[PDB]
Amino acid sequence: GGGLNNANVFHLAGLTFLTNANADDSQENDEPCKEIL
Amino acid sequence: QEQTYVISAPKIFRVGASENIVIQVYGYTEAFDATISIKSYPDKKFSYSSGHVHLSSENKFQNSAILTIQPKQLPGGQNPVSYVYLEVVSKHFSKSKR
Amino acid sequence: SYQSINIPVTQNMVPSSRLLVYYIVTGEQTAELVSDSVWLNIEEKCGNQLQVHLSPD
Amino acid sequence: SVAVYGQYGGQPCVGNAFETQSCEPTRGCPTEEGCGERFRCFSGQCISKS
Numbered sequence A: 001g002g003g004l005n006n007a008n009v010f011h012l013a014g015l016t017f018l019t020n021a022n023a024d025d026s027q028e029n030d031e032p033c034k035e036i037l
Numbered sequence B: 001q002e003q004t005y006v007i008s009a010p011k012i013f014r015v016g017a018s019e020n021i022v023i024q025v026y027g028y029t030e031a032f033d034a035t036i037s038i039k040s041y042p043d044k045k046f047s048y049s050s051g052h053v054h055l056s057s058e059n060k061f062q063n064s065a066i067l068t069i070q071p072k073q074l075p076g077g078q079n080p081v082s083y084v085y086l087e088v089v090s091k092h093f094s095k096s097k098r
Numbered sequence C: 001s002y003q004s005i006n007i008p009v010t011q012n013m014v015p016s017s018r019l020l021v022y023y024i025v026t027g028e029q030t031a032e033l034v035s036d037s038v039w040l041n042i043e044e045k046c047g048n049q050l051q052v053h054l055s056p057d
Numbered sequence D: 001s002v003a004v005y006g007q008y009g010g011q012p013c014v015g016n017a018f019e020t021q022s023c024e025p026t027r028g029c030p031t032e033e034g035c036g037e038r039f040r041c042f043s044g045q046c047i048s049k050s
Helices: A007-013
Strands: A015-019 B004-009 B019-025 B032-040 B045-057 B062-069 B084-090 B092-098 C019-024 C031-041
Touching: A007 A015, A007 C019, A007 C031, A015 B092, B004 B084, B004 C019, B019 B032, B019 B045, B032 B062
Parallel strands: none
Antiparallel strands: A015 B004, B004 B019, B019 B062, B032 B045, B032 B084, B045 B062, B084 B092, C019 C031
16 A cells, blocks of 8 residues: 555556546556565 | 546456446535546547436535446457546536546 | 544455545645555455365264 | 717717626536646646656
């Protein structure tokens, strides 16, 4: 959980969003994620 | 920028899945409807699925649409469809995202 | 104070779940989407809980 | 409209050309689309984050 940013919080949660609230996650592209839990 | 919305969706739509798409809007106080739809990309020509959701004070302006991209409706053939438009439309806003 | 998330953990959660929490606050004239999430570790409880045993022992 | 424009020092039309009513709208007020990835100026204009 957690995240660097609101868009990063959504992206790491495995979500995406539409908003007009001055955020988008199209900047949030990343390598495949291999953290272990 | 008082009147704002969030539509939250799975990062990726699984074909044949039912994707529960939830919309929240803030600062509205009059009830209004929105439709959330999945439309073919880039042409927006074919509506694979659409959901009509009522946003109002007893909803607390929060609702969700159960949208499903039925697999045989995608064109298929030599190229798989890699993208689709999630779109919302209301009295107050419209946005679509690939 | 704000209400807790009191919802019961459901059988559709049993492998794992993720809680995300968000609000938009629009102070001044500018909105910020504010959000957090946590990993939720849920018991591997089977839905049907099939169990098999031999009658003699 | 001004049916007949005042000419040669004829008295101009007096009062407002417009009047306004309170009314129940059929339309929603279109929202701002926020700046997304771009930096948002306090006015609400958007500029490159660079």
